[PDB]
Design goal:
The protein is α/β, with parallel strands linked by helices. The protein contains 5 helices and 6 strands. The chain has a single domain, classed as 3-Layer(aba) Sandwich (Leucine Aminopeptidase, subunit E, domain 1), CATH 3.40.220. It has a 6-stranded mixed β-sheet, with helices on both faces. The longest helix has 18 residues. The two termini are about 15 Å apart. Homodimer. Interacts with RNase III. Interaction with the ribonuclease decreases homodimer formation. InterPro entries: Macro_dom (IPR002589), Macro_dom-like (IPR043472), O-Ac-ADP-ribose_deAcase (IPR024900).
Length: about 170
């Protein structure tokens, strides 16, 4: 009742925090990251510039929170998922870190709802089935011990990911 799967544009979901699967530069790029920057407006990039000035690039697995600009959210958490290189380079744990670190920032900033994209399944090539299992498992275990966020939304652009997620959520 606290976890939901939604097929659509994450930039239009009204929630407290929208998670952005970005690259270490935080300067924005393609895919959902590009869609998020456009919707949020130039204020997003300006906030990311300030972050870079204070902490440099965002390492894989790391997360940082900023304002959301024109997005229908109170904040945007930028995190970097691993690039898939076969599975023998800690990619599984790094993906987990991206989800967990993102959740921690959401809780730490007292937010109630967060929407996640299918991290690393874009151009990073993380195997979809395995990526979804990690995301579902990671989020599930987190909310089981944390009151915040209250609601988590897995926003999938690809029907393939949406089906995988709904199957995993009921397979528990």
């Amino acid at each position: 009742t606290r976890i939901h799967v939604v097929q659509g544009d994450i930039t239009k979901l009204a929630v407290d925090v929208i998670v952005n699967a970005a690259n270490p530069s935080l300067m924005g790029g393609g895919g959902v990251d590009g869609a998020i920057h456009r919707a949020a407006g130039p204020a997003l990039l300006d906030a990311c510039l300030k972050v870079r000035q204070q902490q440099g690039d965002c390492p894989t697995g790391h997360a940082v929170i900023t304002l959301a600009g024109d997005l229908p959210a109170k904040a945007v958490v930028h995190t970097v998922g691993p690039v898939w290189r076969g599975g023998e380079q800690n990619e599984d744990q790094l993906l987990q870190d991206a989800y967990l670190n993102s959740l921690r920032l959401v809780a730490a900033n007292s937010y109630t709802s967060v929407a996640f994209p299918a991290i690393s399944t874009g151009v990073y090539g993380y195997p979809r089935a395995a990526a979804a299992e990690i995301a579902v498992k990671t989020v599930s275990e987190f909310i089981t011990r944390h009151a915040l966020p209250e609601q988590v939304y897995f926003v999938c652009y690809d029907e393939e990911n949406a089906h995988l997620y709904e199957r995993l959520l009921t397979q528990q």
